[PDB]
Design an enzyme around this catalytic site. Structure first.
Site, PDB file in Angstrom:
ATOM      1  CG  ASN A 120      -2.182  -0.844   0.920  1.00 24.34           C
ATOM      2  OD1 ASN A 120      -2.892  -0.599  -0.051  1.00 24.34           O
ATOM      3  ND2 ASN A 120      -2.420  -1.850   1.746  1.00 24.34           N
TER       4      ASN A 120
ATOM      5  CD  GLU B 279       0.496 -18.677 -22.652  1.00 21.24           C
ATOM      6  OE1 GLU B 279      -0.453 -19.486 -22.588  1.00 21.24           O
ATOM      7  OE2 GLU B 279       0.550 -17.757 -23.492  1.00 21.24           O
TER       8      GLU B 279
HETATM    9  N1  LIG Z   1      -4.860  -1.235  -2.105  1.00 19.54           N
HETATM   10  C1  LIG Z   1      -5.947  -1.112  -1.351  1.00 19.54           C
HETATM   11  N2  LIG Z   1      -6.013  -1.722  -0.115  1.00 19.54           N
HETATM   12  C2  LIG Z   1      -7.122  -1.600   0.654  1.00 19.54           C
HETATM   13  C3  LIG Z   1      -8.196  -0.859   0.196  1.00 19.54           C
HETATM   14  N3  LIG Z   1      -9.155  -0.901   1.143  1.00 19.54           N
HETATM   15  C4  LIG Z   1      -8.719  -1.645   2.181  1.00 19.54           C
HETATM   16  N4  LIG Z   1      -7.456  -2.083   1.897  1.00 19.54           N
HETATM   17  C5  LIG Z   1      -6.625  -2.932   2.770  1.00 19.54           C
HETATM   18  O1  LIG Z   1      -7.442  -3.819   3.504  1.00 19.54           O
HETATM   19  C6  LIG Z   1      -6.994  -3.911   4.840  1.00 19.54           C
HETATM   20  C7  LIG Z   1      -8.147  -4.183   5.795  1.00 19.54           C
HETATM   21  O2  LIG Z   1      -9.016  -5.143   5.247  1.00 19.54           O
HETATM   22  P1  LIG Z   1     -10.360  -4.658   4.519  1.00 19.54           P
HETATM   23  O3  LIG Z   1     -10.348  -5.054   3.071  1.00 19.54           O
HETATM   24  O4  LIG Z   1     -10.477  -3.161   4.649  1.00 19.54           O
HETATM   25  O5  LIG Z   1     -11.550  -5.351   5.344  1.00 19.54           O
HETATM   26  P2  LIG Z   1     -12.327  -6.666   4.852  1.00 19.54           P
HETATM   27  O6  LIG Z   1     -11.610  -7.424   3.764  1.00 19.54           O
HETATM   28  O7  LIG Z   1     -13.731  -6.276   4.468  1.00 19.54           O
HETATM   29  O8  LIG Z   1     -12.399  -7.585   6.160  1.00 19.54           O
HETATM   30  P3  LIG Z   1     -12.787  -6.878   7.540  1.00 19.54           P
HETATM   31  O9  LIG Z   1     -11.553  -6.211   8.082  1.00 19.54           O
HETATM   32  O10 LIG Z   1     -13.282  -7.915   8.514  1.00 19.54           O
HETATM   33  O11 LIG Z   1     -13.843  -5.839   7.264  1.00 19.54           O
HETATM   34  C8  LIG Z   1      -6.340  -2.581   5.142  1.00 19.54           C
HETATM   35  O12 LIG Z   1      -5.204  -2.768   5.949  1.00 19.54           O
HETATM   36  C9  LIG Z   1      -5.917  -2.062   3.793  1.00 19.54           C
HETATM   37  O13 LIG Z   1      -4.528  -2.220   3.680  1.00 19.54           O
HETATM   38  C10 LIG Z   1      -8.139  -0.249  -1.047  1.00 19.54           C
HETATM   39  O14 LIG Z   1      -9.085   0.415  -1.459  1.00 19.54           O
HETATM   40  N5  LIG Z   1      -7.007  -0.372  -1.818  1.00 19.54           N
END
Ligand SMILES: Nc1nc2c(ncn2[C@@H]2O[C@H](COP(=O)(O)OP(=O)(O)OP(=O)(O)O)[C@@H](O)[C@H]2O)c(=O)[nH]1
Ligand SMILES: Nc1nc2c(ncn2[C@@H]2O[C@H](COP(=O)(O)OP(=O)(O)OP(=O)(O)O)[C@@H](O)[C@H]2O)c(=O)[nH]1
Ligand SMILES: Nc1nc2c(ncn2[C@@H]2O[C@H](COP(=O)(O)OP(=O)(O)O)[C@@H](O)[C@H]2O)c(=O)[nH]1
Ligand SMILES: [Mg+2]
Ligand SMILES: [Mg+2]
EC number: 3.6.5.-
Lengths: 34, 426, 428, 201, 428
Positions: free
Chosen positions: C197, C245
């Site tokens: 990130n 591939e």
């Molecule tokens: N690259 C990117 N990473 C993201 C984004 N949104 C959340 N993340 C990553 O996702 C991590 C947290 O997990 P989330 O995807 O937000 O939450 P979830 O998958 O719904 O699972 P829960 O935490 O239980 O809600 C954070 O530490 C971020 O690093 C995004 O829009 N872009």
């Protein structure tokens, strides 16, 4: 209040008009040079 | 969506309870006559988290009011934003339970508790989507401590899988009307450790000190002391009401913050805090709300965090902002205060964004945080408890209604346990 | 007849797929209503007359982000049934999104996998997007990858994982979700691309020169990665590739399938005047050690394979002279058992530009998917981070009471450990 | 006759069409009275529809569209709660496309001009003024009453307000969207709007 | 010529044929006066001055729904004497419909059926809807089926029956009434189609997303099944399946005549444009167990025969490919003694959508009437309900003082066990 996905993920033609209103737009050379 | 059940208990609990329903009604644009005002989709798509719809379309509260007086029940009824509350959820009890844990928990409060579990039942099984409860009460009195923790106990064996979240009001040692706070609060902490999983400590010392210093207030009325509490209450559950970029939850807060399950006591901050004199004059940005959330006084509890160590913290942000600035603000505040965080928990900072700002502001943050400086107040009110217990200070009002002296020493032993567990994790 | 299915799980996957399908809809000329005013056959099924439904499924246990897509402007684009809202989010817990609340969603999400993969034979792959440290990102993603393994035997699974940051975590349970996911990611996925990130925050800071980027700017760059990855299936080119591939050209051993990602050029429009973008310099900028999207320094990593896809007007041998100069330049060091180490695909169509994005219009682009032994550092730092907090049973009672057994953390440790020892066994 | 025979709109339609039929037969084996499919009318006259800042839009801008009447009230909590969702459906659906597909014409149950304007200030679609008698004629035509106070013609009130009803060319209702109806899907009934069959031609 | 006489006995029978005689009027252009503004003779008869009256009888012992039809929007389309109503309800009692009050209505019912016979040439069948849980529907259902089978025994006696659902039902005496219908739906019924309300509810709430549907929303779904089944009798086109080819490629044994319906392009308005709406998926949805229109899992059984009546713009090449993949899938099984157990009913007529209902303008439909050995289970729950009921003399005295003889209750239980004995031996 305008959340992020609504505020930036709007359709391209509307964003096109909005930013057209705000200013959107070894080496090698052309065949002229020697 | 996720239903949240609000219950407020006590003269103190009903006053914050009414003020909380000023704030979230302003956030969601609802008139005191109940109808919705404006064209504001982002405050209405998640109306069911705190509201219910009801026949004529009035957004009726999911709010339950208990207090064993005809006291602040009719003052909040006749007051502003008080015609929202249902004229069924008002359960009075007209005898008084003045400053006694017995008249709220074992005797008297035990007969009206059989009707407030009814109101909890028929409100909650209407839709089986309950995310959590939200209990407000003071432990330094009668109805709020006794009947407040009595509903706290019996709700947990009927829903033993869901959050209950107490915005408790602890003794507040210096400014202390009446004289039975050390008996009432110490004999109420030992339930807030067992059948509780989310406790929010709020003192009137640091609430007054926020008023006198970050606002500079001269005549701080009880209305705007509760306005600070209600702002922090609305900010800790902002994601259950508004969409966001990094979506938080009450359970996301619970899983991520608390260690081993008896460590669930949290300081609270809400820090775009200025006066009205220097109200136009502030660069309101992410790097300076972090400076304001992390300096002593802004915490609403009177336990100084620089004498301890944040085991796990949370920085639940609200507003229009860019995310690597909150990420680098969490990392550098951990870097300069490396002694103030725990060496066996890397990255002691939760972050989240509720996107929609609070009403009036443009950005804000709710800093809920586990601290091992929290036993500073626990040893303080246990010291007041043992100073009265040695000489047998006023106790016949307690044991006359029927309790054992052995029960009191069980309360002091269970609470002195909490002092030791925080110490060995410090 | 190429037909790839995109599965987005977790809150990260949902909005990284909002921008992934943002790039795909304006690439093909498909408006948000779904109409155009057979190159689309790999991401869009033509429904009825003139409309193109995406080959997508959206999963989350909370409704708050997924009905936001329903209530937004991309309402009529998507078929309304694969938009899956749960009842309660897993709340940063591997045990809840996998055992208790994850069961009511897998039986219906794979039901749409039935109805979306039964159209035409010869399925191309599974572009799955997830977070690693998220609760439903790790738990619900694990359940789909296990049950797609038993239902589909030999089908490709291109997984894009937003790995935990080395410094940022935005959670303390982040090692507990990262370690227990690689238990159930080694034997299930086929090509796992690791993403960071703040590596891409650094990319926006230095390359894009934008003061305040945020997650919606992350997802635009990652969308360009997926578009340049599958540009061969959509459009013709001089050297077409196919994701059946990529596994045969990138990963030597069945257990090592972890790759870095890179893109070039990332130039703001106001600095695009000062250079003439050529192939002999975008390859060098792609290989530059501060340009990857994982923040893993490759100076101590022996490279094992590379996959450089080129887009737009590119002649095939200034690619070949770019790869000739990077064989002979010392700072990237190739492993001694792999003499040739490149695959160079070329596509004719240049990358498109989102309006309101920060990416300048460019005539040529490179995306590098490189498998290297640098990944040992990415997993050894999580090795140190997890057991330091698992030293005294921190936060284990949430997982144990939700369905984990005490010792599942223990055995998920030694197979993450066996993951690093194979890396230095290659490097010798 | 559609949907109700005993409507003021229907009886003025009937008298005008059958009067043209009598004059045609007098000028001329003609079916008298005429048939319902052969009956024709102009539903909105010239000075009917006004958007924001009060400019007149004729019926010719509604062709090839999916148009719907929205009966609402200013003081109704139902109407207040439903209004942002309909703004949301309107904006996202209409602006998601090369052309705009749906159109809403608003008709009112407000007590006075002040309530009318205060409710109008948020609405960008077309509207009919309260003092125009057509807002009462269409009201009795579509059976929408807040309470039983019209002398109704053996009806029942098809719905309470708010109401969206998609309208055809000659006053027939194409499909009912059930907010407060037998299906009672409040604020999710706008999803049930289909726009391929109800082309206002 | 060709014709189907429709008999509607009971409150369920009146309201199912209520939507049936609305769809049959819409598909032909029969306006609700009888006047159109030769593919209509199976359901309507000419009346000289352009009037088309249905070939129908509406029988109900209670004057509460028939007189409502007599004061409805279809008063001047039905024949006044074709609506035969009693004065006293049978009131959930098989004893009233068969022993006490079914004598002044059954003589008028066979009177109007007699007149409906000798005005049409080529009487194909006696398609009847009844309400086996419920006194008028079951009691007069038994008397009509026996008295029609002593003077007309030769013609088809095809019957759709509303069997009670296992969990959901709206009576307490219906376990008695349903087993007392068994000796009329076994030795007198030629074709029995099992229905129940709860599975029809599930279809219109999962596939049409009507979370809170009502009785009339079930009647339109049944009315589409009736029209598509008798679509060969009216509309021309490809392979035609009348009501003689129905019970000769579907009914294996003289007493094994219980089948299930699976009309399943059931899509309302906003899931139809987003999908393919093709021949390949309507068969996969019709064979889907949760789309079975009566609550009976076909996996806990074994098919003997299935007749998929396709209608619309389907071509035989897609039909033969769609049935081919039903053979390949191992979830769906057939008996070892019927290798070819499929029939196709391809007809060239798109289905008619009611203007204001809950269906779209679907271009292609299929309804499959399938005999399986799993239909023993809708009688196995019936065993358990009657056993706990009749063990210690439940609601019995209402029968006893009303013409019922004891021992008839016991032989109905032994007939129901005899049906399950045949259905468990056929699947071997
Ligand atoms: N690259 C990117 N990473 C993201 C984004 N949104 C959340 N993340 C990553 O996702 C991590 C947290 O997990 P989330 O995807 O937000 O939450 P979830 O998958 O719904 O699972 P829960 O935490 O239980 O809600 C954070 O530490 C971020 O690093 C995004 O829009 N872009
Ligand atoms: N599918 C469907 N089932 C119906 C309908 N109407 C009634 N039923 C069923 O009929 C059962 C009750 O019996 P009824 O049909 O109402 O009564 P009846 O046939 O007139 O006989 P009585 O009980 O003597 O009045 C209920 O359990 C329903 O399941 C209908 O319109 N559609
Ligand atoms: N912050 C805050 N504290 C209060 C409020 N009302 C009472 N208190 C405190 O609570 C104590 C009195 O307890 P009280 O609520 O009256 O006991 P109860 O009526 O039995 O619940 C006093 O010492 C006050 O300091 C209030 O509205 N806000
Ligand atoms: Mg998330
Ligand atoms: Mg009846």
């Amino acid at each position: 209040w305008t959340t992020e996905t609504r505020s930036e993920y709007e359709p391209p033609r509307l964003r096109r008009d909005q930013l057209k209103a705000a200013g959107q737009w070894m080496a090698i050379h052309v065949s002229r040079t020697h | 969506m996720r239903e949240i059940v609000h219950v407020q208990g006590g003269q103190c609990g009903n006053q914050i309870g009414a003020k909380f329903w000023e704030v979230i009604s302003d956030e969601h644009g609802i008139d005191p006559t109940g109808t919705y005002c404006g064209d504001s989709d982002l405050q209405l798509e998640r109306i069911n988290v705190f509201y219910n719809e009801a026949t004529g379309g009035r957004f009726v509260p999911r709010a339950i009011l208990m207090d064993l007086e005809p006291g602040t029940m009719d003052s909040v009824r006749a007051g502003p934003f008080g015609q929202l509350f249902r004229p069924d959820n008002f359960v009075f009890g007209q005898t008084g339970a003045g400053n006694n844990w017995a008249k709220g928990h074992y005797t008297e409060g035990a007969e009206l508790i059989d009707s407030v579990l009814d109101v909890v039942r028929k409100e909650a099984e209407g839709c089986d989507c309950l995310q959590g409860f939200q209990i407000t009460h003071s432990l330094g009195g009668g109805t709020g401590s006794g009947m407040g923790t009595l509903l706290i106990s019996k709700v947990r064996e009927e829903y033993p899988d869901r959050i209950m979240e107490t915005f408790s009001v602890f003794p507040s040692p210096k400014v202390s009307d009446t004289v039975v706070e050390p008996y009432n609060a110490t004999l109420s902490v030992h339930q807030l450790v067992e059948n509780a999983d989310e406790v929010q400590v709020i003192d009137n010392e640091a609430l007054y000190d926020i008023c006198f210093r970050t606002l500079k207030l001269t005549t701080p009325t009880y209305g705007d002391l509760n306005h600070l509490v209600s702002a922090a209450m609305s900010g800790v559950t902002c994601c259950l009401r508004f969409p966001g970029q990094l979506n938080s939850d009450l359970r996301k807060l619970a899983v991520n913050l608390i260690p081993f399950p008896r460590l669930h006591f949290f300081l609270i901050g809400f820090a775009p805090l200025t006066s009205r004199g220097s109200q136009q004059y502030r660069a309101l940005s992410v790097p300076e709300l972090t400076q304001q959330m992390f300096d002593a006084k802004n915490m609403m509890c009177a336990s100084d965090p620089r004498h301890g160590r944040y085991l796990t913290a949370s920085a639940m942000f609200r507003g229009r902002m860019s995310t690597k600035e909150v990420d680098e603000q969490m990392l550098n505040v951990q870097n300069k205060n490396s002694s103030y965080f725990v060496e066996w928990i890397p990255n002691n900072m939760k972050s989240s964004v509720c996107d929609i700002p609070p009403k009036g502001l443009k950005m804000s943050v709710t800093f809920v945080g586990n601290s091992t400086a929290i036993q500073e107040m626990f040893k303080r009110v246990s010291d007041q408890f043992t100073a009265m217990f040695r000489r047998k200070a006023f106790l016949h009002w307690y044991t006359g209604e029927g309790m054992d002296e052995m029960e009191f020493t069980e309360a002091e032993s269970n609470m002195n346990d909490l002092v030791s567990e925080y110490q060995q994790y410090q | 007849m190429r037909e790839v299915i995109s599965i987005h799980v977790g809150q990260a996957g949902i909005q990284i797929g909002n921008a992934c399908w943002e790039l795909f809809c304006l690439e093909h000329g498909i408006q948000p209503d779904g109409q155009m005013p057979d190159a689309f056959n790999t991401f869009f099924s033509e429904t009825g007359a003139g409309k193109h439904v995406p080959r997508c499924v959206f999963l989350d246990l909370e409704p708050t982000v997924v009905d936001e897509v329903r209530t937004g402007t991309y309402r009529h684009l998507f078929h309304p049934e694969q938009l899956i809202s749960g009842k309660e989010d897993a709340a940063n817990n591997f045990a809840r999104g996998h055992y208790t609340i994850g069961k009511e969603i897998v039986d219906l999400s794979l039901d749409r996998i039935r109805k979306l993969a039964d159209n035409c034979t010869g399925l191309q792959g599974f572009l799955m997007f997830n977070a690693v440290g998220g609760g439903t990102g790790s738990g619900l993603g694990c359940l789909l990858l296990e049950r797609l393994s038993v239902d589909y035997g030999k089908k490709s699974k291109l997984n894009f994982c937003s790995w935990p940051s080395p410094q940022v975590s935005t959670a303390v349970v982040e090692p507990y979700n990262s370690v227990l996911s690689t238990h159930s990611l080694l034997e299930h996925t086929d090509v796992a691309v690791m993403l960071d990130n703040e590596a891409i925050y650094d990319i926006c800071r230095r390359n894009l020169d934008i003061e305040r980027p945020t997650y919606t700017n992350l997802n635009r760059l990652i969308a360009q990665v997926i578009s340049s990855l599958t540009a061969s299936l959509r459009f013709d080119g001089a050297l077409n590739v196919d994701v059946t591939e990529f596994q045969t050209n990138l990963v030597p051993y069945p257990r090592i399938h972890f790759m870095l990602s890179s893109y070039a050029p990332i130039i703001s429009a106001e600095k695009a005047y000062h250079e003439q973008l050529s192939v002999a310099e975008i390859t060098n900028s792609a290989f530059e050690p501060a340009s990857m999207m994982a923040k893993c320094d490759p100076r101590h990593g022996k490279y094992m394979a590379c996959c450089l896809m080129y887009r737009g007007d590119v002649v095939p041998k200034d690619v070949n002279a770019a790869v000739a100069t990077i064989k002979t330049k010392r700072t990237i060091q190739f492993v001694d058992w792999c003499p040739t180490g490149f695959k160079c695909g070329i596509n004719y169509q240049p990358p498109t530009v989102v309006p309101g994005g920060d990416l300048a219009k460019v005539m040529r682009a490179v995306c590098m998917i490189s498998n290297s032994t640098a990944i040992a550092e990415v997993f050894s730092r999580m090795d140190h981070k997890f057991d330091l907090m698992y030293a005294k049973r921190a936060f284990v009672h949430w997982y144990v009471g939700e369905g984990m057994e005490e010792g599942e953390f223990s055995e998920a440790r030694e197979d993450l450990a066996a993951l690093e020892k194979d890396y230095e066994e290659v490097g010798i | 006759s559609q949907p109700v025979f005993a409507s003021p709109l229907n009886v003025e339609k009937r008298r005008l069409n059958e009067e043209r039929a009598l004059m045609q037969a007098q000028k001329a084996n003609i079916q008298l009275p005429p048939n319902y499919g052969d009956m024709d009318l102009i539903l909105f006259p010239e000075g009917s529809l006004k958007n924001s800042n009060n400019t007149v839009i004729p019926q010719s801008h509604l062709k090839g569209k999916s148009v719907a009447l929205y009966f609402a009230d200013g003081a109704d909590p139902k109407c207040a709660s439903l209004l942002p969702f309909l703004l949301n459906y309107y904006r996202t659906m209409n602006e998601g496309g090369a052309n705009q597909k749906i159109e809403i014409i608003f008709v009112s149950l407000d007590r006075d001009r002040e309530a009318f304007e205060s409710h109008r200030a948020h609405m960008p679609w077309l509207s009919i003024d309260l003092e125009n008698p057509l807002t009462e004629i269409l009201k009795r035509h579509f059976r929408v009453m807040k309470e039983y106070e019209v002398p109704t013609y053996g009806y029942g009130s098809r719905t309470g307000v708010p109401s969206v009803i998609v309208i055809g060319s000659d006053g027939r209702e194409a499909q009912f969207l059930p907010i407060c109806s037998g299906l009672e899907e409040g604020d999710r009934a706008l999803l049930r709007w289909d726009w391929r069959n109800t082309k206002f031609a």
